[PDB]
Amino acid sequence: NGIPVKLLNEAQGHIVSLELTTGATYRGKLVESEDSMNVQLRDVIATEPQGAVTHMDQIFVRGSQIKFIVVPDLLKNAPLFK
Amino acid sequence: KSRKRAKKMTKKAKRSNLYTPKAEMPPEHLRKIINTHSDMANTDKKAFLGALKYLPHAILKLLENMPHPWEQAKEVKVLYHTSGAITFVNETPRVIEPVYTAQWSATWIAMRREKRDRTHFKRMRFPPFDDDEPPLSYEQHIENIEPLDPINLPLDSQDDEYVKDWLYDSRPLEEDSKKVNGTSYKKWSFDLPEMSNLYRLSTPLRDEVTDKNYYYLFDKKSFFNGKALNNAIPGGPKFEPLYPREEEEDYNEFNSIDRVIFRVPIRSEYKVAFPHLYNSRPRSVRIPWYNNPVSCIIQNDEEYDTPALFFDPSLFAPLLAEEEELILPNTKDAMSLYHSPFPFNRTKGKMVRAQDVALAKKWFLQHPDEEYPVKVKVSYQKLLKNYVLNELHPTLPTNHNKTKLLKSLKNTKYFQQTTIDWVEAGLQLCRQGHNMLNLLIHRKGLTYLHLDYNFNLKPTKTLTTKERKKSRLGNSFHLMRELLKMMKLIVDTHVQFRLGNVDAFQLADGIHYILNHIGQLTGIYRYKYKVMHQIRACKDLKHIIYYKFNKNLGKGPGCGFWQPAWRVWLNFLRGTIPLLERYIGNLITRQFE
Amino acid sequence: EHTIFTQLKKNIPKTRYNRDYMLSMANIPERIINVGVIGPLHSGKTSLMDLLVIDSHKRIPDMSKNVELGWKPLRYLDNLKQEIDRGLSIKLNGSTLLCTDLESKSRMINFLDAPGHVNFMDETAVALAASDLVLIVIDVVEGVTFVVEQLIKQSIKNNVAMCFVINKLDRLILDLKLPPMDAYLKLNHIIANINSFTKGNVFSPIDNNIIFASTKLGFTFTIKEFVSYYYAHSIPSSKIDDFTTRLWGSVYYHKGNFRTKPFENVEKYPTFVEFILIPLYKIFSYALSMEKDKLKNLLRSNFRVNLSQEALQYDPQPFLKHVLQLIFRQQTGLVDAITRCYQPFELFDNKTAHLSIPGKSTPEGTLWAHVLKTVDYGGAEWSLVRIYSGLLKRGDTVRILDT
RNA sequence: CAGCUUUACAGAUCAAUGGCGGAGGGAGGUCAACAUCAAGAACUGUGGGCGCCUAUAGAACUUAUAACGAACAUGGUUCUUGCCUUUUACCAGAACCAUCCGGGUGUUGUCUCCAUAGAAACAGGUAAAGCUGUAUUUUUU
RNA sequence: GUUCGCGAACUUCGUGGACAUUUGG
Numbered sequence A: 001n002g003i004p005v006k007l008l009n010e011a012q013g014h015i016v017s018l019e020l021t022t023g024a025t026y027r028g029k030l031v032e033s034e035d036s037m038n039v040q041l042r043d044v045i046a047t048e049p050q051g052a053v054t055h056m057d058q059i060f061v062r063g064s065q066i067k068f069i070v071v072p073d074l075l076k077n078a079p080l081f082k
Numbered sequence B: 001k002s003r004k005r006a007k008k009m010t011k012k013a014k015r016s017n018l019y020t021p022k023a024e025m026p027p028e029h030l031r032k033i034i035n036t037h038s039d040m041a042n043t044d045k046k047a048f049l050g051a052l053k054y055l056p057h058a059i060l061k062l063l064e065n066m067p068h069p070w071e072q073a074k075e076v077k078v079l080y081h082t083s084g085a086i087t088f089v090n091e092t093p094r095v096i097e098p099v100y101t102a103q104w105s106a107t108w109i110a111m112r113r114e115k116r117d118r119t120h121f122k123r124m125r126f127p128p129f130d131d132d133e134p135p136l137s138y139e140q141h142i143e144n145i146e147p148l149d150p151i152n153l154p155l156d157s158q159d160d161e162y163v164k165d166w167l168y169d170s171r172p173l174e175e176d177s178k179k180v181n182g183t184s185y186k187k188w189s190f191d192l193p194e195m196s197n198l199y200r201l202s203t204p205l206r207d208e209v210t211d212k213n214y215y216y217l218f219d220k221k222s223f224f225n226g227k228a229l230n231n232a233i234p235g236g237p238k239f240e241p242l243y244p245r246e247e248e249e250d251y252n253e254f255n256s257i258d259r260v261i262f263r264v265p266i267r268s269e270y271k272v273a274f275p276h277l278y279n280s281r282p283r284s285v286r287i288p289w290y291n292n293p294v295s296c297i298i299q300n301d302e303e304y305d306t307p308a309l310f311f312d313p314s315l316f317a318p319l320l321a322e323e324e325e326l327i328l329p330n331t332k333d334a335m336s337l338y339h340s341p342f343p344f345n346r347t348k349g350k351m352v353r354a355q356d357v358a359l360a361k362k363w364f365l366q367h368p369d370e371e372y373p374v375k376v377k378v379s380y381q382k383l384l385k386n387y388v389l390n391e392l393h394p395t396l397p398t399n400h401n402k403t404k405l406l407k408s409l410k411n412t413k414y415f416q417q418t419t420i421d422w423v424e425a426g427l428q429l430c431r432q433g434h435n436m437l438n439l440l441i442h443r444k445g446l447t448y449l450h451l452d453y454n455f456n457l458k459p460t461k462t463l464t465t466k467e468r469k470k471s472r473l474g475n476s477f478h479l480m481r482e483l484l485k486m487m488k489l490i491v492d493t494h495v496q497f498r499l500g501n502v503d504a505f506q507l508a509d510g511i512h513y514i515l516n517h518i519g520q521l522t523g524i525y526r527y528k529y530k531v532m533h534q535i536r537a538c539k540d541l542k543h544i545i546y547y548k549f550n551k552n553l554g555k556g557p558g559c560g561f562w563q564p565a566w567r568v569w570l571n572f573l574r575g576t577i578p579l580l581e582r583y584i585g586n587l588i589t590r591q592f593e
Numbered sequence C: 001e002h003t004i005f006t007q008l009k010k011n012i013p014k015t016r017y018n019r020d021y022m023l024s025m026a027n028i029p030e031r032i033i034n035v036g037v038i039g040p041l042h043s044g045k046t047s048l049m050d051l052l053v054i055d056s057h058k059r060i061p062d063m064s065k066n067v068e069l070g071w072k073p074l075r076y077l078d079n080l081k082q083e084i085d086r087g088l089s090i091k092l093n094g095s096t097l098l099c100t101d102l103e104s105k106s107r108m109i110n111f112l113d114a115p116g117h118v119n120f121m122d123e124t125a126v127a128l129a130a131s132d133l134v135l136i137v138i139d140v141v142e143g144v145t146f147v148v149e150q151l152i153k154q155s156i157k158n159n160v161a162m163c164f165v166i167n168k169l170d171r172l173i174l175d176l177k178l179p180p181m182d183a184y185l186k187l188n189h190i191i192a193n194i195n196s197f198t199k200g201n202v203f204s205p206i207d208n209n210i211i212f213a214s215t216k217l218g219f220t221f222t223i224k225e226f227v228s229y230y231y232a233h234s235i236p237s238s239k240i241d242d243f244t245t246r247l248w249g250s251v252y253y254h255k256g257n258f259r260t261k262p263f264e265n266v267e268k269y270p271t272f273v274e275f276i277l278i279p280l281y282k283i284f285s286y287a288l289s290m291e292k293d294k295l296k297n298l299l300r301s302n303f304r305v306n307l308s309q310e311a312l313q314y315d316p317q318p319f320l321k322h323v324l325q326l327i328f329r330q331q332t333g334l335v336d337a338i339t340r341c342y343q344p345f346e347l348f349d350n351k352t353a354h355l356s357i358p359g360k361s362t363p364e365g366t367l368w369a370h371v372l373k374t375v376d377y378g379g380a381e382w383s384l385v386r387i388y389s390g391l392l393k394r395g396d397t398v399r400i401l402d403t
Numbered sequence D: 001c002a003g004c005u006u007u008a009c010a011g012a013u014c015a016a017u018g019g020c021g022g023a024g025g026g027a028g029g030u031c032a033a034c035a036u037c038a039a040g041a042a043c044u045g046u047g048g049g050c051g052c053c054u055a056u057a058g059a060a061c062u063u064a065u066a067a068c069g070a071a072c073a074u075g076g077u078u079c080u081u082g083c084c085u086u087u088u089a090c091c092a093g094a095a096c097c098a099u100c101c102g103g104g105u106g107u108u109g110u111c112u113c114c115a116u117a118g119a120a121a122c123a124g125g126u127a128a129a130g131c132u133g134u135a136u137u138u139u140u141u
Numbered sequence E: 001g002u003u004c005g006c007g008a009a010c011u012u013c014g015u016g017g018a019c020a021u022u023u024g025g
């Protein structure tokens, strides 16, 4: 199975950042993730590609349309890789 | 390379220069020496005098290398003085412990069979030879008829296939292989089937019921608790009270008759099981265990791995799929082995003295008291007490240099390591012992009294008060004499066995008689009465054996299994040797300080 | 301030996972299962906890040679003289550990090892109060006793998620010497009993709730775990859940790659018996009985785990234990099962209400925490406290109530 | 059926760099002499060898606990039973030292079986051993 | 093993006690 998927799963709880194909960055507590990166997030801000930002509650995103996910730097340490 | 060489040199010449290891000489030479000594009949050299100091140790060593019923002749290594004196055994005896147990079990079985068979079992008469005369023997023994069939039961090829080729042998065997370290014989390893076989063989002897719960209130901790509460268990032992029995309750506001309700009887049994609750003021009382219950099945049938006596319930290949059929041919008994007590649950171990390997212990810890006679029960209790006290006060040693090895090394005048028949060695010791006694006597006031060759000292004639005063001598000397006599008796039985007009079964039986009757056959108790404790212990052991032995219709004089008694004797000897040695030293250093 | 902390850290066993990570995780809820390991007297829950501890740590201080070999347990949470001398775990002397799952989602778990013995329900009760999940543990053999039923009843009341641990399979393989079929039947019966004891939830090896264990030897598995280790090799990924489902219950599997028809033809032994229990039995036999080389070969082939040179020269019980540890790995399966069990947090609110009346919480403006039990962990007194809401920092000036 | 390392090699040039060490044995024996002994070894010190191993020595704390030894005998002082009185010699219980009988660990030597190079690899080829591997909504048709 | 007592067919089985020793001549 995919180690990036595993990492994503681990990041559950933590405040992940998240850009899509559209280029609309989010940042929030990662509620749930699946094998396909079907992310849910809480307390989430939402930047438009142009500039403006909008607060929102419980966003769902489908991994297909996700581009890249930033996880907190604590997860670097352990305990997924070995 | 040069540097390395230099280093090596430094390592070498700084401390401990090469003392040459002396060769193993012929027994013929030893015999010749002995003969010469005999011819000589006193010399009173200094070296000779010095060597005499270590006779009780020698005796002890000899005793330790007793040939077991399964062994024809214990061929044994020996140190011996240039004169032909103090000719004592070198090697320590030792054994693969489960193997040893198996052997013992086999012997027991054989004995039982013999009992079943023979009607008029002729017991051995003691003392075996004419004490008035000096019937010793060497040459005769050497060129005697074939040492007749010793005690080993006949094994079938089906069941005990893996052992029968090696089981009954000197060392014992499995001595030259991958299954041991080597001839030094310190670490033993095993495969399964052989181990299983050994276990099976044992069962007759060591059926210790190892449901840890069986020993509820018969664990050493429990016994300790009992001791330090002045409390008992019908089957368990009893002691002096360990603290002063000073009650004086004075029926207070608390603990009155009309305050408390005497509903439970509050027996002794409870007080140790819950030391801190039922007993008030538990000084130095260890916390006992509290374990879970056992579900098990142990059987002797053809079929395996089935519900026998349980209650019945209500209603790509998987990864091993005909690699196997779920039961291999050994796994029937593998499981049993796994379940077992110490020796066998392990397939490797360290070897132990055979004066270790207590085969009694497990019987006299096993809470028997139902349908036995009272004497037996008493004996068991005594045994427990003996054990328990020992457990309570252990002992710690440290760095030391052993005497035999020292003599081998530094001493001239010694020749060393002549492989003698053990019986021959014993005989020599007996002779030498006798000589030593005579020498001692000579050194003291030269007496009217003379030794029997079987050591029973007695006056020749001319009995007076002055004479008595002169020739009271020490208790130590008499103890020594007694010890010598004992050795002779055991040695003499072996001698008898070696010659005709005897049996191997009789040999073991004779040995048993000797050991389990010191009190009858020779009084040490007269001179050292702590030997009486030992004697008592031996008696108890004998008692335990006899009931255990004679469950079947057999009841009479024939029964070997001398092991525990022998062990006890060895222990006693060990306890006593040092004092004896000291005494001897004192005697020799009479003129000087 | 820091020096003291450093010193404290030093006087401690170095954990295999980094404790920093655990700490970080703890800063987030929902990554913290609080687990009460509970059961009857001598279930082997303490032993199980010991296994977990072993898995966690690199090398333990008072882990003797004998214990390492696998003779005596090393009940790592027995602690105080009383308990080691006595045999019984007596007080709630728990442990906290990070644990990866099947699919390695780490999660910092706050295990509390109950006492079994019935006169210490106090500690058990405390554990229940603390712990949002409870690993009930049961002796296979002793079965679901009345005690266990009572526990179950008084874990539904609390309330809590109930993973079960059918511990002591060795006892039915080696002590009872049940045939494999018989063993399976017994297990089924036990499961049924458990279900009966329960009101609402059904428990089974499928749906990750049963955890089959033998702590003496020291293996736990769930069925999913087993599949992961030893049946990904031989099946395509899509049909793994299905396979798992098939595994338990009145189901049979005939020579057909890959069906698996419920029932049936000629030689019986069900899916569970064929793909699990039977395998276990074989392992046991081989471990004890077989020529060692052949066993090794088998383990290279059928499990891809290598009996080392030093391990080969072991005695049986130890050797067997070693084998089983090699097979079923450092117990992730159990953790996974636990995770599956705990809803999570639908229950938690209810539990909190039960503890302290129904109502509504306040996260930021305050913190509150149940001081559960005073203890004597490091000689001196501590209060084992559970923080329900807020975050309680060191030195903080704090309100309290004896209840 | 693909790849990388690791040995046997052919014949290389030949660096090159790695690794191999620039070579020092492996066994055992009722062979010794010497230390050092519950295992621990935390934490510190001070070495080799890289927030960490390996040796050392220093206490801490461990439990010792059941088993340096699945073993158990014997002395002595003191206290207390009890023989009783006296000597041994003991009865039967404590406390603290000692005594044997055995034991491992490494250090070294010495004595009988098993061995056996003085270098090898680069570039790939041959042979074996070890790990990783099918398009219709979430990844690459 | 050695004595004394009691139960069953002097003799033997089932059994309850008691069984140091020398210096002080």
Ligand SMILES: Nc1nc2c(ncn2[C@@H]2O[C@H](COP(=O)(O)OP(=O)(O)OP(=O)(O)O)[C@@H](O)[C@H]2O)c(=O)[nH]1
Residues within 6 Å of the ligand: B292, C040, C041, C042, C043, C044, C045, C046, C047, C048, C073, C075, C087, C088, C089, C090, C114, C115, C116, C117, C167, C168, C169, C170, C171, C175, C213, C214, C215, C216, C217
């Ligand atoms: N045969 C067998 N024995 C086991 C097994 N698990 C544990 N035991 C043994 O049975 C006892 C139970 O283990 P413990 O850890 O003492 O039980 P516990 O969890 O401490 O019980 P509490 O003290 O009441 O909590 C121990 O003596 C174990 O060695 C098993 O799976 N098979």
